[PDB]
Amino acid sequence: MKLNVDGLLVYFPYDYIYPEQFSYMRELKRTLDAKGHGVLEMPSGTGKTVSLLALIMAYQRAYPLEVTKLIYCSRTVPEIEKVIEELRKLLNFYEKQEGEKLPFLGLAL
């Protein structure tokens, strides 16, 4: 389910995205393109991380020099544990599309 965002093409593992998600990625890309700090709200607790993560993965590949690393923090360790699962699922989907390992590392301190 690749998404041809206005900024670039963004891979997405799940089948469908609600219209708000379209606004989410472009809104996030706007701040990332401007390279300026910003704040945004998205209701869904689940699927927000993957949508947030999905753009970063595409953004990193498109502009690896623009962004060095991703620092995604969570309130509580019990909640960060489920977050990395979303990233792990996305990586397998993205890796499966490519068909080979990529220089991507993800871990939780």
Binding site: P43, S44, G45, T46, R75, T76, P78
Partner: protein, 185 residues
């Protein structure tokens, strides 16, 4: 405040009627009691007993716990969550925000409650489009200022027609709401 409300219900037959309708759990400061009670709560929902977990909005239990399908189906916000204004530590924090950054003392105080009230009640909609209703047991929330500070997704869905539902009227619409959500897609 929770104990006083519990005690008043305990003296009256309201609490016993609630106990008959469903199991009721209360929360205490100690985490060990909360952990055991919460685990029992999750057991009640799995079975048909169901459980009414009374908690404090600012308690560590509310922020830590997450409510999903058939868990906290009808989150109830009893009164706006406010701290003891006599707390000097809060006053110093509150006073500075008025002194600098140009924020009214009441505006921030309401903002903290509105942000916190939405924090605990927004878990019922975690994901997978699992139906869940949120009831605010206070006429204050109906005020325009409170609604404005309310999150967009919760705010925009909320309409003026159901804004001031009566206790029994709110119950009836909730029963209707469950019916529509109960049926499959």
């Amino acid at each position: 405040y929770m104990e006083s409300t519990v005690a008043s219900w305990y003296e009256q037959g309201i609490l016993e009627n609630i106990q008959r309708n469903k199991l009721l759990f209360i929360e205490t400061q100690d985490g060990a009691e909360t952990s055991v009670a919460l685990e029992k709560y999750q057991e009640a929902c799995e079975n048909g007993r169901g459980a009414i977990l009374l908690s404090v909005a600012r308690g560590k239990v509310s922020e830590g716990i997450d409510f999903v399908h058939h868990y906290g189906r009808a989150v109830i916000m009893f009164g706006v969550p406010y701290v003891y204004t006599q707390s000097r530590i809060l006053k110093a924090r509150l006073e500075y925000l008025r002194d600098q950054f140009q924020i009214r003392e009441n505006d921030f105080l309401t903002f903290d409650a509105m942000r916190h009230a939405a924090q605990c009640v927004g878990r019922a909609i975690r994901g997978k489009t699992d139906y869940g209703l949120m009831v605010f047991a206070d006429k204050r929330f109906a005020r325009g200022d409170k609604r404005g500070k309310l999150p967009r997704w919760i705010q925009e869905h909320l309409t003026d027609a159901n804004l001031n539902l009566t206790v029994d009227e709110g119950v009836q619409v909730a029963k209707y709401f469950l019916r529509q959500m109960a049926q499959p897609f």
